[PDB]
């Protein structure tokens, strides 16, 4: 078939996918903070 | 009259309407771009 | 007085139990 | 059993996807990392740094004690080098 | 059925059964008071919750006498 | 210090011994 | 003593379940119904009603 | 027939007996009010409002 | 008077009676302690 | 076309790695006790 | 808080009076 | 008319059905989930409870949480632009604005979601018993995260969003409200515990009373997605339980309604109990017991024992659990048994 | 007032088939809700005002 | 002991009244011809 | 007589008995009757029990000042520990009721019978030609009773430490447990509540979905239940309409369409979850407790920065410091 | 509120319900007057409990 | 008291024998088909 | 006043029980077809 | 089992209910005084 790209599903998927990775990256950095 | 907290209330009452606006704006628009039958 | 009340209800539940198991409505198939 | 959306399977397999996401995914990652590692996050959320819970001597907690003048009260808590 | 004095006098008030206005009738006008009521409540709520302070309105056992 | 070097190889080893089989196509 | 004792109780237990499971299957496998009740010859349907 | 928790559906469209019903209800609520009062008047002590 | 045509009969099967009584009794066994307090 | 079974086992190890980094961080970070 | 449930119940029973007692035929779902 | 076109678009059968409800659901639901995930990793609870509560500070998935606002805030809605935060974001965070954010947002998200069920049901033309059921989880959220703290001094005593932060909510209710001794909580557990039984028992009863509709052992494939005959012998199941338990179902329509009733009724009862705990109208004691325990020093029940456990919980926790009270309990005033 | 409402409830029970509840058109029981609501609401506000 | 005086009647009526209700129905159901 | 014993075995095993007294039943039926009869008598008239072996009798029976909610059957003495205490081990009954003798007679007979009850749940399934495994679902609740009535006592060194047989007595078992093991902070318990919460959830899920998608065959004023006859050929609900709705609630592939895969999940979830909860009590019976994050996050100077984990510890100390008032003589609680 | 109540009442005694609504809120079906009333009744309830 | 011990023991032996001599009595045989 | 504690329940059960009996019958009679 | 052929139905007319209740109630009005003593 001739499927589209940007769809509603796409939007949704990204609202959760994009922040997640941004957080997983943030957290991953925290593993090195100390005192 | 028109106290700081009253000003804030408008700021929130206005910033809210906007969200309702842009939301229903986009919606009404994209809605009228496909639905053939 | 309280003891009597507690035991009574209990005795009543067990009575129920009996009747429920041995005096239920026979479960009839298809033609019900 | 179907709708307009392009079957994930195909996409997660399309070389195009990875050519895109090999860039996009690590990008977001390195961003968030920097968000923490540059100490920015600490200021965006007023979260104390390991050396900012108490003042050197003080062992008391900066408990906010009144609603309306709270923000003002909070600011003063940062004053004592907390 | 069974008509009665009072029954007849009240007969008009109950007869226009299924009578509806056409299309979207008064709907839009209604949808305005509705939004007004919604804002009205949010105000008196936020006033009670001391989120919206107004010199003159002291939400306490005081301001009484 | 960083024996993660070890894990890495012996880790990609497992999928490898079946990957080479997806290439030489046979007996999976 | 704490590590050993706990690990081995978990294992011991699940194995008793494993037992039950494989023993229950074997008895149904043998006699031959470990895959469902024969739609046609449904055993229960040939037994008198206890009701 | 009707399950126990549906016995009152016998009024869903019988405006007469529906009014007969709400009248009885109102009667009970008014009745309770009257008599709950008397109960308080028979036990309330006015000897000290302080 | 005319026999009101809106009436149906009422029913409660044996199982329901049992299920019923079980609920009443056990509730009583649960709350009696607090009633005697 | 990238074979699915590879997309998984790669994205798989990738998770065991990040989630494992978290577990290491529990004996070094601020969440330590030392 | 109890009456809320009454609302949710009676409300439902009004907008779904038709499908009350059960449903019936066809097999449409996943295709507009 | 645009309306019917707006409608048309929304009610379109996509991968993730939007619908009218979605206009309420998705915005909130996402913000709620988002705010938590935000606070969980970045915002602190220092200025609010004198507690570290985020990954950024060193907390792990168990110890992390979005803690309630100060007790000073009272029942304030704590709007970002309200008298407290004053439009400022950072301050808002430090004053526990993210709590009322998650709470109130998530609250509407549950309204939207039930509405969705209601809306989707209607379209698909099925009965809304999925909506009725979902009333139970609402009641719980409403009574515990809203009604409860609304009866107390402030939001501070509402359960904080987090794993560990919820365990203390449990321990608190024991120590202070003697919640386990509450008739409504008991019914609660009776429903959830009993509901988790029906789940298990019915599932197992079905899988092991199945007809053979295939030649394989893994009987999963052997199922007819397009109705027809019953996939499991309802008649055999009946006889089984009728001989092992003495009682057994025999009307799938009732057996399934029962499965809705039990756990939904349970959660409702557990809610009422808490609604009473708001006003502190608890089920703390049995007067007849206390009176005998006073006069007679040798009378001891498992009940009296428990109350002493509560005394210890209150005395040893209250200090760091209620900071705003500036509690100071000298070692000598602290209740303690022998040696310990 | 309770005693009177009682007697009233009785009368309305026996004389359930008053014509007022039958729709002239369909000749079957019917109540025009929309207009009733208006009526009642009028009386409410009228009494509310007075209070 | 030192219990509530009304406890007994509260429990009694709590059991009888609704049980009595059910029984009234069941028996009236049970006796409907055909 | 075709042969007495041959007949006996044919009766016992007979599938024509109102209640299937099985082979396991031959052990079950007597053991369960002893347990129940002893219980009922104990709970009503038994005298005070010196549970903690410190001569400080705890009365838990109705006739001795208790009500349903507080009353219980008190665990055997701590002086007895794990020793076997059958009636014939006491100079008299008076001594036996004082040292919590009834408790053992009850727990042992119950656990015994409740096991055979599982064995029976297999037997009848065998005699009826149906697949087994139902008894494997019942293995979870049983494995808990075992964990709570036998494993924990063996582990802790005394039956006096087993869960009491009563409402309030159970709450005691919990509150104290938490203090000594911090169970809320243990993976196995969390999985347990997941299974239980989930169970109730799914129980409501299934229950609702199905009942809501029933094919109409009933009147508007007739119980929707009557639309089903015991011994039907075809299904009584539209599992395709059910899946249609639920598939739209979340999204298609996150919804069941296979009744068999549905019901397996329906059974698998709680049983597996409860299995772990049972393994939790059985593991913490050897003092491998929940996570201890006390004083974990500390600041740059060394000060201790509290977390909710610490606030939990205070609540725990209160329980610790107050339970068994007069039973401790030394610093550490190692029993 | 009394006056507004008197005004609003008259309106509903005169103006009829827009077809769209009468259909949507299944009017002319008394078991919906209930659904709405209850919603108001419990709203009133939650408020008096607070004051 | 020494009697009760004896009696109980006897009683338990009875049932435990009935149990072993039971499944021994060709129990697999007892079932719907294949035996 | 200084009345009997069981007086209340004695009078209550004395009224309910037999009245309840009658009602059970009447209603079961009343509902017999034809 | 065979449906036992010795059973008849039971009946209590409306008047009997009334006459019954009248008896029960008044007896209660007569003995309650002595019950409370
Ligand atoms: C159901 C389906 C789901 C629906 C979900 C809907 C989500 C919407 C949630 C919105 C909730 C907002 C409520 C805020 C609030 O209540 O805010 C609380 C306020 C009152 O605030 C209190 O006010 C003060 C009370 O002291 C009082 O007494 C004196 C001594 O301090 C003082 O003078 C003080 O001024 C005086 O008001 C204190 O400061 C308290 O700490 C607190 O601040 O009530 C008020 O606004 C008025 C209360 C209105 C009634 C509604 C409340 C619900 C019933 C709860 C009853 C408790 C049980
Ligand atoms: C549509 C879904 C939705 C809903 C229901 C809410 C609801 C809410 N949000 Mg919110 N929010 C949403 C989406 C939504 N949000 C999105 C998408 C975002 C991201 C941008 C946010 C971001 C956000 C933030 C950052 C905050 C909230 C907050 C709040 C709460 C209080 C806000 C308030 O006072 O509103 C006021 C209500 C209105 C403005 C509605 C007005 C409608 C009328 C009809 C228009 C009239 C306009 C006109 C000018 C008035 C004339 C009157 C005249 C006399 C002046 C409230 C529960 C606050 C909160 O959580 O505090 C704890 C808060 O800080 N939200
Ligand atoms: C505004 C008040 C109100 C009114 C007028 C109705 C009216 C009605 N409801 Mg109802 N309902 C209400 C509130 C109300 N409900 C609330 C708040 C709830 C949630 C708790 C429900 C839940 C509910 C359900 C679940 C059902 C109904 C049904 C019905 C209908 C049949 C009634 C029936 O025969 O019951 C029979 C009544 C009895 C024989 C049993 C009553 C036993 C009660 C529980 C014991 C307590 C009695 C005590 C005096 C009550 C004190 C009143 C208190 C509020 C002060 C009827 C139209 C039924 C219907 O839809 O049928 C298809 C139905 O299934 N209702
Ligand atoms: C003859 C008329 C009459 C009068 C004058 C009274 C007078 C009184 N009654 Mg009363 N009562 C009446 C009829 C009357 N009753 C009837 C018919 C019943 C049976 C239903 C009762 C049942 C009753 C009870 C059960 C009680 C009283 C009580 C009282 C006393 C306290 C009043 C109170 O605070 O009300 C409070 C008023 C409200 C509940 C406010 C109503 C406002 C609602 C919430 C709005 C309704 C929504 C509305 C339609 C929206 C449209 C409005 C529009 C303008 C916007 C008072 C002496 C109380 C008393 O102390 O005992 C003796 C009491 O407990 N009455
Ligand atoms: C704690 C246990 C528990 C959880 C976690 C849970 C979760 C869920 N239940 C659902 C449904 C149900 N549950 C039901 C009966 C039950 N559910 C029960 C117990 C639970 N149910 C019990 C005991 C019952 C028996 C009465 C029914 C009948 C349904 C459904 O129909 C529905 C479903 O679809 O099932 C699969 C789903 C609704 C999703 C949604 O509305 O998103 C949209 C809304 C969002 C995302 C906003 C949520 C905001 C909340 C209030 C704030 C949360 C704060 C943080 C985000 C969370 C972290 C905080 C924690 C760490 C404490 C969701 C997966
Ligand atoms: C697209 C799909 C994604 C949608 C996301 C939905 C949300 C999913 C749940 C998010 C869980 C967050 C866990 C996390 O971030 O841990 C992040 C933490 C970070 O770890 C911390 O690191 C340092 C912080 O300075 C310290 O060393 C701390 O001690 C701690 O170790 O990882 C853990 O320690 C726990 C391990 C992960 C356990 C997660 C299990 C969750 C199970 C429940 C699932 C829900 C039901
Ligand atoms: C070894 C034997 C052990 C004895 C077990 C005793 C079981 C108790 C039976 C109770 C009666 C059940 C009943 O009346 O419903 C009898 C019904 C069976 O009858 C029903 O009849 C119809 C309903 O309209 C349908 O055909 C149903 O499918 C079903 O057949 O059971 C149910 O449907 C409900 C299931 C739940 C049963 C209750 C569980 C028992 C829990 C008891 C807890 C109380 C303990 C108190 C302690 C003091
Ligand atoms: C120290 C040792 C003590 C030994 C005691 C003496 C021996 C036992 C005497 C039993 C007397 C009581 C009779 C009971 C009748 C009966 O149960 O139903 C009668 C039916 C029909 O039996 C069928 O009855 C038939 C006769 S007839 O139908 O009853 O006329 C008969 O032909 C057939 O064989 C029979 O199976 O009995 C059965 O179906 C067999 C199962 C019996 C199960 C026993 C009870 C199980 C208890 C489990 C544990 C519960 C714990 C407590 C819970 C409350
Ligand atoms: C707050 C706020 C807001 C919002 C924001 C947002 C919306 C956010 C989002 C966010 C997000 C959205 C985030 C996310 C995150 C996520 C994460 C961080 C995850 C992690 C995960 C993990 C770690 C996993 C794990 C696991 C599991 C769980 C299972 C098992 C396996 C594994 C291991 C894989 C706004 C601005 C509006 C306003 C202000 C306020
Ligand atoms: C006829 C007449 C008369 C008389 C009248 C009268 C005398 C009346 C009375 C009346 C009354 C006297 C009434 C009463 C009523 C009451 C009620 C109606 C009540 C109710 C109650 C309830 C319902 C409760 C409930 C409960 C309980 C029990 C417990 C829990 C909680 C609750 C609250 C829920 C006269 C002479 C005038 C003249 C005219 C004629
Ligand atoms: C449906 C309702 C949805 C409402 C969503 C509103 C979200 C935005 O809410 C809005 O945030 C901005 C900050 O970004 C606040 O703005 C605040 O901070 C800015 C600086 O950053 C100040 O210049 C401003 O004076 C102050 O009020 C507004 O006071 C608040 O009303
Ligand atoms: Mn009873 Ca386990 Mn507390 Mn040390 Mn003993
Ligand atoms: Cl203790
Ligand atoms: Fe099912």
Helix ranges (DSSP H) in chain E: 5-10, 27-48
Paired with O165 in beta bridges are O73
D59-64 contact pairs (CB < 8 A, 24+): D59/O303, D61/L46, D61/L50, D61/L323, D62/L46, D62/L47, D62/L50, D63/L47, D63/L50, D63/L70, D63/L323, D63/L324, D64/L47, D64/L48, D64/L70, D64/L72, D64/L73, D64/L95
* Length of chain N (residues): 34
Label residues O84-96 b or e (16+ Cβ within 10 Å = b): ebebebbeeeeeb
Token output for L308:
């002493």
Asked if L15 contacts O254 with a C-beta cutoff of 8 angstroms, the reply is: no
Q: How far apart are CA J22 and CA J26, in angstroms?
A: 7
- Nearest by CB to residue I10, choosing from H1, H11, H17, is H1
- CB pair distance less than 8 Å for J22 and A35: no
Rounded Cα–Cα distance for residues N19 and I22 (Å) = 9
The answer to whether the beta carbons of residues O311 and L317 sit under 8 Å apart is: yes
End-to-end CA distance of chain L: 77
Q: How many CA atoms lie within 13 A of D47 on its CB side?
A: 26
Ligand located closest to L135 CA: 5
S12 contact partners, CB below 8 Å, separation of at least 6 = R22, R25, R26, R28, R29, S20
Bridge partners, residue P18, by sequence:
E21
Query: How far is the C-alpha of L6 from the C-alpha of B32, rounded, in Å?
Result: 7
Q: Which long-range contacts (CB under 8 A, 24 or more apart) does O88-94 make?
A: O88/Q1, O88/Q2, O88/Q4, O88/Q5, O88/Q8, O90/Q1
Domain of residue B33 covers: 1-37
CATH number, domain containing residue B19: 1.20.5.510
The angle formed by the CA atoms of residues L259, L264 and L266, to the nearest 5 degrees, is 105
**How many C-beta atoms surround the C-beta of residue L297 within 10 A?**
7
* L246 closest CB neighbour out of C21, C27, C29: C21
Q: Is L76 exposed, middle or buried (0-12, 13-18, 19+ CB in 10 A)?
A: buried
Q: Give the H or E element holding residue L65.
A: strand L65-66
Which residue matches tokens 């302080």?
A: H50
Give phi and psi for O273, each to the nearest 5.
Answer: -65, -45
Q: What are phi and psi of O58, to 5 degrees?
A: -110, 110
Tokens of R11: 């009078």
SS3 I14: helix
* Residue E21 tokens, joined: 């206005």
- Give CA–CA dist D29/O33, Å, rounded: 66
Q: How far apart are CA Q21 and CA I3, in angstroms?
A: 72
* Tokens representing residue P16 in the block: 């009829």
Q: Nearest ligand to the C-alpha of residue L132? A: 5
Compute the residue count for chain Q.
35
CATH number for region E1-51: 1.20.5.880
Asked if residue L151 has its Cβ within 6 Å of ligand 5, the reply is no
Ligand 5 atom closest to residue L30's alpha carbon, by position in its atom list: 46
Q: Which residue intervals of L66-163 are DSSP H helices?
A: 89-94, 97-124, 129-133, 135-142, 148-151
Residues 6 or more apart in contact with residue J13 via CB below 8 angstroms: F11
Please list every residue in chain E whose beta carbon sits closer than 8 Å to the beta carbon of residue L100: none
Give the three-state DSSP class for M17: coil
Short-list L95, L63, L51, L45, CA closest to L162: L63
DSSP labels for chain J?
---HHHHHHHHHHHHHHHHHHHHHHTTTSSSS--
What Rg value do the Cα atoms of chain O yield, rounded? Answer: 26
Phi, psi of O263, deg, nearest 5: -60, -25
* Helix locations, D1-82, DSSP H: 8-11, 15-37, 40-44, 70-79
CA angle in degrees (0–180, nearest 5) for L254-L259-O223: 25
* Residue O267 near residue L259, CB atoms below 8 Å: no
- What is the rounded CA–CA span in Å between residue O128 and residue B25? 66
- Coil, strand or helix: which one is O214? strand
Report the C-alpha gap between O201 and O198 in whole angstroms: 5
Torsion angles phi and psi, residue Q34, rounded to 5: -30, 115
Q: Both tokens of residue K2?
A: 């109890």
C-alpha angle O91/O93/O99, rounded to 5°? Answer: 85
Distance of alpha carbon M34 from alpha carbon M28, whole angstroms = 18
Chain H CB contacts of O226 under 8 Å are: none
Report helix, strand or coil for A32: coil
Chain M hits for I4, CB-CB cut-off 8 Å, are 16-17
End-to-end CA distance of chain K: 39
CB contact under 8 A, O230 and C7: no
Helix (H) or strand (E) segment spanning residue P11: helix P2-14
**What are the backbone angles phi and psi of residue E22, rounded to the nearest 5°?**
-90, 145
Question: Residue E12, Cβ neighbours under 10 Å: how many?
Answer: 9
Residue that is written with structure tokens 């199905």 in the block: O210
C-alpha neighbours within 13 Å on the C-beta side of residue P13: 14
> Are 3 or more Cβ–Cβ pairs between E and L shorter than 8 Å?
yes
The dihedral over CA atoms of O292, O297, O298, O299, expressed in degrees to the nearest 10, equals 180
Torsion of CA O267, O268, O269, O274, to 10 degrees: 90
Calculate ∠ Cα L194-L200-L204, nearest 5°.
145
Look up residue L179 and give its two tokens. 């919640």
| Contact yes or no for G34/L208 (Cβ under 8 A) | no
- Tell me if O203 CB under 6 Å of ligand 5: no
Cα–Cα dist S37/J30, whole Å? 77
3-state secondary structure F1-28: CCCHHHHHHHHHHHHHHHHHHHHCCCCC
Please name the residue that has the structure tokens 């014993």.
O5
- F10, two tokens: 């012996």
Tokens of C15: 């009575």
Query: Which tokens in the block code for residue O262?
Result: 């549905």
The dihedral sign for the CA sequence O61, O64, O67, O71: negative
Contact E16, P14 (CB under 8 A): no
Reading the block at residue D11, the tokens are: 């996409």
State the structure-solving technique. Answer: X-ray
For residue O165, the 8-state DSSP code is: E
Q: How many CB atoms lie within 10 A of CB O203?
A: 33
Token code pair at residue P46? 């939650």
Rounded CA-CA distance M13/M25 in Å is 25
Centre of ligand 14 from the C-alpha of residue O211, in Å: 10
Contact L64, L57 (CB under 8 A): no
For residue K2, the SS3 value is: helix
Nearest to residue O230, comparing CAs of A28, C10, G49, M50?
G49
Nearest to L176 by CA among L19, L4, L311, L72: L311
Q: Round to whole Å and give the CA distance between D52 and D81.
A: 7
Helical ranges in chain O per DSSP H: 4-12, 25-45, 93-98, 101-127, 134-137, 139-146, 152-156, 167-181, 187-212, 239-249, 259-283, 308-322
Which of P8, P15, P16 is the mutation pick for testing E, counting most E CBs within 10 A? P16
Selection from L277, L193, D1, P49 nearest residue O243 by Cα: D1
Contact I31 L287 (CB under 8 A): no
Q: How many domains does chain B have?
A: 1
If we measure between CA atoms, which residue out of L115, M31, H14 comes closest to residue P27? M31
L256 in Cβ contact with O225 (< 8 Å): no
Give the integer Cα–Cα distance in Å for Q19 and C21: 27
What letter would DSSP give residue L145? I
Enumerate the residues of chain H whose CB falls inside 8 A of the CB of residue O220: none
Residue burial D22-59, b: 16+ Cβ < 10 Å; e: rest: eeeeeebbeebbebbbeeebbeebbbbebeebbeeeee
Distance CA(J28)–CA(K5), nearest Å, equals 51
How far apart, in Å, are the Cα atoms of O237 and each of G4, L127, O213, S24? 51, 12, 6, 51
The answer to whether the CB atoms of O221 and I8 lie below 8 A apart is yes
Ligand nearest to the backbone CA of N14: 10
3 state SS for O125-156: HHHCCCCCCHHHHCHHHHHHHHHHHHHHHHHH
Phi and psi angles of residue O40, each rounded to the nearest 5 degrees, phi first: -45, -40
How many CB atoms are closer than 10 A to CB G22?
12
The minimum CA-CA distance between F2 and chain J, rounded to whole Å, is 13
Beta bridge partners of O166: O72
The kind and range of the H/E element at L66 are strand L65-66
Q: How far is CA L15 from the centre of its chain?
A: 29
- Which segments within N1-34 are labelled E, that is strand? none
Question: Rounded distance, CA K32 to CA I8, Å?
Answer: 43
Task: Centre a 10 Å sphere on the Cβ of residue O281 and count the other Cβ atoms it contains.
Answer: 25
Window 1-32 of K, Cβ < 8 Å to L:
1-2, 4-5, 8-9, 12, 15-16, 19-20, 22-23, 27, 29-32
Pick the CATH number of D2-82 from 3.30.70.580, 3.30.420.10, 3.20.20.10, 1.20.5.860: 1.20.5.860
Q: Are O291 and O316 in contact (CB under 8 A)?
A: no
Helix (H, G, I), strand (E, B) or coil at L106: helix
Instruction: Say if residues J10 and F16 touch (Cβ distance below 8 Å).
Output: no
Specify whether the CB–CB gap between L211 and G35 falls below 8 A: no
* I4 and M CB contact within 8 Å: yes
Angle of the B4-31 helix axis to the E27-48 helix axis, nearest 10: 150
DSSP secondary structure of O50-115: -TTSSS--B--SGGGT--TTT-EEPPPPTTTTT----GGGSS-HHHHHHTTHHHHHHHHHHHHHHH
CA proximity to L322, closest of L157, L170, L152: L157
Structural contact between residues P13 and M49, judged by C-beta atoms closer than 8 angstroms: no
The rounded Cα C22 to chain-centroid distance in angstroms is: 9
Question: What are the angstrom distances between the C-alpha of O223 and each of I14, L7, M29, P32?
Answer: 15, 36, 25, 22
Strands (DSSP E) along L171-216, which ranges? Answer: none
> Distances in Å between the alpha carbon of L117 and those of H23, L164, O197, O246?
38, 32, 21, 9
Radius of gyration of chain B (CA): 16
Q: Ligand 9 mean position to L34 CA, how many Å? A: 6
């Amino acid at each position: 078939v001739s499927y589209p790209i940007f769809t509603v599903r796409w939007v949704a998927v990204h609202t959760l996918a994009v922040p997640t990775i941004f957080f997983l990256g943030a957290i991953a950095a925290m593993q090195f903070i100390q005192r | 009259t028109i106290t700081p907290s009253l000003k804030g209330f408008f700021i929130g009452l206005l910033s809210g309407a906007v969200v309702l606006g842009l939301t229903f704006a986009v919606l009404i628009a994209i809605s009228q771009i496909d639905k053939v039958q | 007085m309280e003891t009597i009340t507690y035991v009574f209800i209990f005795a009543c539940i067990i009575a129920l139990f009996f009747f429920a198991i041995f005096f239920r409505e026979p479960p009839r198939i298809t033609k019900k | 059993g179907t709708t307009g959306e392009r079957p994930f399977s195909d996409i997660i397999t399309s070389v195009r996807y990875w050519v895109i996401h090999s860039i996009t995914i690590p990008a977001l990652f390195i961003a968030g990392w920097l968000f923490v590692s540059t100490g920015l996050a600490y200021d965006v959320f007023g979260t104390p740094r390991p050396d900012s819970y108490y003042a050197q001597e003080q062992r008391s907690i900066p408990l906010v004690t009144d609603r309306f003048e709270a923000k003002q009260q909070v600011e003063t808590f940062l004053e004592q080098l907390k | 059925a069974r008509r009665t004095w009072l029954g007849d006098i009240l007969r008009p008030l109950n007869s226009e059964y299924g009578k509806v206005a056409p299309g979207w009738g008064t709907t839009p006008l209604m949808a305005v008071f509705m939004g007004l009521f919604l804002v009205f409540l949010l105000i008196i709520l936020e006033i009670y919750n001391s989120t919206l302070i107004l010199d003159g309105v002291n939400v306490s056992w005081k301001a009484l006498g | 210090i960083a024996q993660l070097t070890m894990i890495a190889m012996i880790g990609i080893a497992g999928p490898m011994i079946i990957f080479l089989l997806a290439v030489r196509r046979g007996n999976l | 003593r704490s590590w050993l004792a706990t690990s081995h109780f978990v294992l011991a237990f699940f194995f008793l379940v494993g037992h039950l499971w494989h023993a229950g299957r074997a008895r149904a496998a043998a006699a031959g119904f470990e895959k469902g009740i024969d739609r046609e010859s449904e055993p229960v349907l040939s037994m008198p009603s206890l009701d | 027939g009707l399950p126990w928790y549906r016995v009152h559906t016998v009024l869903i469209n019988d405006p007469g007996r529906l009014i007969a019903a709400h009248l009885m209800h109102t009667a009970l609520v008014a009745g309770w009010a009257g008599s709950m009062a008397l109960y308080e008047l028979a036990t309330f002590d006015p000897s000290d409002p302080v | 008077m005319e026999p009101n045509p809106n009436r149906q009969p009422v029913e409660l099967n044996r199982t329901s009676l049992y299920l019923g009584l079980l609920l009443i009794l056990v509730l009583a066994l649960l709350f009696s302690s607090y009633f005697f307090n | 076309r990238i074979p699915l079974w590879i997309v998984a086992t790669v994205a798989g190890m990738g998770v065991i790695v990040i989630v494992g980094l978290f577990f290491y961080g529990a004996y070094a970070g601020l969440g330590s006790s030392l | 808080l109890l009456f809320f449930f009454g609302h949710i119940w009676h409300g439902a029973r009004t907008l779904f009076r038709d499908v009350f007692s059960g449903i019936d035929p066809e097999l449409s779902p996943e295709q507009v | 008319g645009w309306f019917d076109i707006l409608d048309d678009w929304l009610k379109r059968d996509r991968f993730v059905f939007v619908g009218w409800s979605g206009i309420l659901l998705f915005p909130c639901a996402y913000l709620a989930l988002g705010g938590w995930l935000t606070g969980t990793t970045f915002v602190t609870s220092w200025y609010t409870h004198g507690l570290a509560s985020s990954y950024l500070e060193g907390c792990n998935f168990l110890t992390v949480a979005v803690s309630t606002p100060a007790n000073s805030m009272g029942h304030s809605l704590l709007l970002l632009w309200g008298p407290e935060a004053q439009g400022d974001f950072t301050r808002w965070c430090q004053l526990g604005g993210l709590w009322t954010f998650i709470a109130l947002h998530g609250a509407f998200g549950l309204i939207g979601f039930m509405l969705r069920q209601f809306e989707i049901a209607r379209l698909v033309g099925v009965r809304p018993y999925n909506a009725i059921a979902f009333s139970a989880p609402i009641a719980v959220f409403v009574s515990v995260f809203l009604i409860y703290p609304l009866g107390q001094s402030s939001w501070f005593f509402a359960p904080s969003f987090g794993v560990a932060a919820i365990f203390r909510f449990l321990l608190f209710f024991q120590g202070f409200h003697n919640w386990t001794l509450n008739p409504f909580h008991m019914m609660g557990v009776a429903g959830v515990l009993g509901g988790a039984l029906l789940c298990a028992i019915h599932g197992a009863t079905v899988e092991n009373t199945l007809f053979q509709d295939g030649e394989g052992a893994s009987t999963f494939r052997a199922f007819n997605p397009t109705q027809a005959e019953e996939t499991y012998s309802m008649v055999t199941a009946n006889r089984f339980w009728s001989q092992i338990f003495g009682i057994a179902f025999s009307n799938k329509r009732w057996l399934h309604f029962f499965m809705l009733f039990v756990p939904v009724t349970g959660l409702w009862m557990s809610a009422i109990g808490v609604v009473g705990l708001a006003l502190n109208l608890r089920s703390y004691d049995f007067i007849s017991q206390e009176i005998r325990a006073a006069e007679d020093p040798e009378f001891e029940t498992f009940y009296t024992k428990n109350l002493l456990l509560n005394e210890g919980i209150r005395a040893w926790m209250a200090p760091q659990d209620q900071p705003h009270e500036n509690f100071v309990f000298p070692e000598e005033v602290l209740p303690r048994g022998n040696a310990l | 007032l309770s005693g009177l409402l009682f007697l009233a409830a009785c009368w309305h029970w026996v004389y359930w088939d008053l014509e007022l509840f039958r729709d002239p058109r369909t000749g079957e029981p019917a109540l025009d809700l929309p207009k009733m609501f208006g009526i009642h609401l009028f009386l409410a506000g009228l009494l509310c005002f007075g209070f | 002991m030192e219990v509530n005086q009304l406890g007994l009647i509260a429990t009694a009526l709590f059991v009888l009244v609704p049980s009595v209700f059910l029984i009234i129905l069941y028996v009236q159901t049970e006796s409907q011809q055909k | 007589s075709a042969n007495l014993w041959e007949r006996f075995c044919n009766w016992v095993t007979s599938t024509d008995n109102r209640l299937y007294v099985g082979w396991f039943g031959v052990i079950m039926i007597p053991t369960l009757l002893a347990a129940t009869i002893c219980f009922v008598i104990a709970f009503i008239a038994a005298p005070p029990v010196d549970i903690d072996g410190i001569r400080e009798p705890v009365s838990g029976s109705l006739l001795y000042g208790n009500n349903i909610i507080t009353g219980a059957v008190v665990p055997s003495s701590n002086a007895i520990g794990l020793h076997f205490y059958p009636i014939w081990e006491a100079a008299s009954l008076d001594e036996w009721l004082y040292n919590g003798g009834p408790y053992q007679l009850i727990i042992f007979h119950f656990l015994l019978g409740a096991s055979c009850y599982m064995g029976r749940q297999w037997e009848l399934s065998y005699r009826l030609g149906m697949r087994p495994w139902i008894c494997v679902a019942y293995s979870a609740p049983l494995a808990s009773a075992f964990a709570v009535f036998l494993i924990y006592p063996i582990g802790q060194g005394s039956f006096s430490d087993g869960m009491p047989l009563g409402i309030s007595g159970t709450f005691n078992f919990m509150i104290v447990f938490q203090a000594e093991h911090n169970i809320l902070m243990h993976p196995f318990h969390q999985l347990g509540v997941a299974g239980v919460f989930g169970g109730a959830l799914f129980c409501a899920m299934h229950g609702s979905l199905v009942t809501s998608s029933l094919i109409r065959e009933t009147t508007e004023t007739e119980s929707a239940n009557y639309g089903y006859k015991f011994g039907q050929e075809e299904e009584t609900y539209n599992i395709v309409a059910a899946h249609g709705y639920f598939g739209r609630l979340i999204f298609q592939y996150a919804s069941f369409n296979n009744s068999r895969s549905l019901h397996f999940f329906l059974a698998a979830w709680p049983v597996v979850g409860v299995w772990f909860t049972a393994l939790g009590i059985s593991t913490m019976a050897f003092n491998l407790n929940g996570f201890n994050f006390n004083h974990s996050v500390i600041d740059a100077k060394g000060n201790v920065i509290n977390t909710w984990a610490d606030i939990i510890n205070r609540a725990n100390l209160g329980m610790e410091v107050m339970h068994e008032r007069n039973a401790h003589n030394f610093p550490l609680d190692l029993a | 509120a009394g006056i507004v109540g008197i005004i609003a009442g008259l309106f509903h005694i005169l103006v009829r319900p827009p077809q769209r609504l009468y259909k949507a809120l299944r009017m002319g079906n008394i078991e919906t007057v209930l659904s709405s009333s209850i919603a108001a009744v419990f709203f009133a309830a939650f408020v008096v409990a607070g004051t | 008291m020494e009697t009760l011990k004896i009696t109980v023991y006897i009683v338990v032996t009875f049932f435990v024998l009935l149990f072993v001599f039971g499944f021994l009595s060709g129990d697999p045989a007892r079932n719907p088909k294949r035996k």
